[PDB]
Amino acid sequence: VSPNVVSVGKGAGVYKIVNESSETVATVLPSVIAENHNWYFLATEARSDADIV
Amino acid sequence: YQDKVVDVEVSLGTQPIDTVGFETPMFLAMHGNFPERIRFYVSTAGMVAD
């Protein structure tokens, strides 16, 4: 419930965490590189296909 | 009659000249982002700005 901030993480047990987002990697990446370009390895949390392509 | 004890002419044969370049391509798209007819870009980050 905004403006509160919530973060979820793993403990004991067998399950997985999936996060949705109103944005997409393609539309977000240009802003990041525009703000700061001091990195070389690119990794992403988006797991599905087009996000990787 | 002459008005100089010494006179010197100097001529420069170093004039540059315009040349054609076989590198830059063009893509004729459909949009209204900018008013002029052509824009040059050096990276996609520049295009995303416009």
Q: Mind telling me how many Å the CA of A32 is from chain B's nearest CA?
A: 11
CB A30 within 8 A of CB B48: yes
The C-alpha atoms of residue B45 and residue B43 are separated, in whole angstroms, by: 5
CB atoms within 10 A of CB B23: 4
Q: Could you tell me if B48 lies within 8 Å of chain A, comparing CB atoms?
A: yes
CB A19 within 8 A of CB A45: yes
DSSP for A27-49 reads HHHHHHHHH---------S--SG
Cβ contact A34–B44 (<8 Å): no
The C-alpha atoms of residue B24 and residue A19 are separated, in whole angstroms, by: 43
Interface list for chain A against chain B, based on CB atoms closer than 8 Å: 30, 33-34
Taking alpha carbons only, the member of A44, A2, A1 closest to residue A23 is A44
Q: What experimental approach yielded this model?
A: cryo-EM
Chain B residues near residue A33 by CB distance under 8 angstroms: 45
The CA R_g of chain B, rounded to the nearest whole Å, is 25
